[PDB]
Hints:
The chain has helices at residues 13-18, 26-39, 66-75, 81-93, 98-114, 122-136, 144-154, 250-255, 259-269, and strands at residues 2-9, 46-48, 54-57, 158-162, 165-167, 171-174, 179-181, 196-201, 204-210, 220-224, 273-279. The chain has one domain (1-280). It is built from nine helices and eleven strands. Strand 8 (196-201) and strand 9 (204-210) form a beta hairpin. Residues 40-279 are annotated as: Catalytic. Residues 25-247 are annotated as: TRAF-binding. This is OTU domain-containing protein 7B.
Amino acid sequence: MEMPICAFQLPDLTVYNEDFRSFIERDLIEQSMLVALEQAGRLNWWVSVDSQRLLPLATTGDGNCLLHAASLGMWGFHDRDLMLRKALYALMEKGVEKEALKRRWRWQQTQQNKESGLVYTEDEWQKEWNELIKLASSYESLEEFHVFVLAHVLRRPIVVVADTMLRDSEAFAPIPFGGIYLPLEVPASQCHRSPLVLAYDQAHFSALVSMEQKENTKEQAVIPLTDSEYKLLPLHFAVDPGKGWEWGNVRLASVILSLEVKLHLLHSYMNVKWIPLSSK
């Protein structure tokens, strides 16, 4: 199967080794995240003729450790979260793409509501938006949209590896983090192409190293842009209805993205490669 993939930069461990402070349960947690993601077929699920094994690199922090993990995946140390948090805030509160980002959030949040018939009032819409802003101000876990905003802060696409559901013996709850986050409100010419790649499991974010890095230096690795069933990964908040679009289904049909359009967005913001692979 010819499937779309993309190269990404592995964490520079040389910086990591210098400043590691006790997180004794690191190996135990990392191992459980690896097994969970591999068994569910979300990580290292493919095989190709031309081999790598990605391993979750856990980190300490508050909540799901999104910013600590992002900092780890970007620079090899996690204490850059503070600068990320303020930048994430300023982009939402005073950013020039604020209105457009808000439209993207409300539109997707509206669609997810339609599946459960929970229609929110206008006052409730404005309340939920300020709760999003408050979560980024400077404890409580960041949400899906904050990952989308983080991509804009970095001006770099973000790929999150995760299961789709929380399961008991049999899904009972959804996991919204898995997929592709593109910096769509930043012109592609002003963005980096190589994605920040993170994993999510047991309510925690983590960076991703490769097994080969334990043996010697390895810079690049491969991450798939489809799931293990060869379906393109979800593009988070990829739909922006116009400023003239009124919230009050021919109209709804026009804004929804086709597979061709999704591929075009990926080509615009990522260096997509195609290799023959198959699932395990």
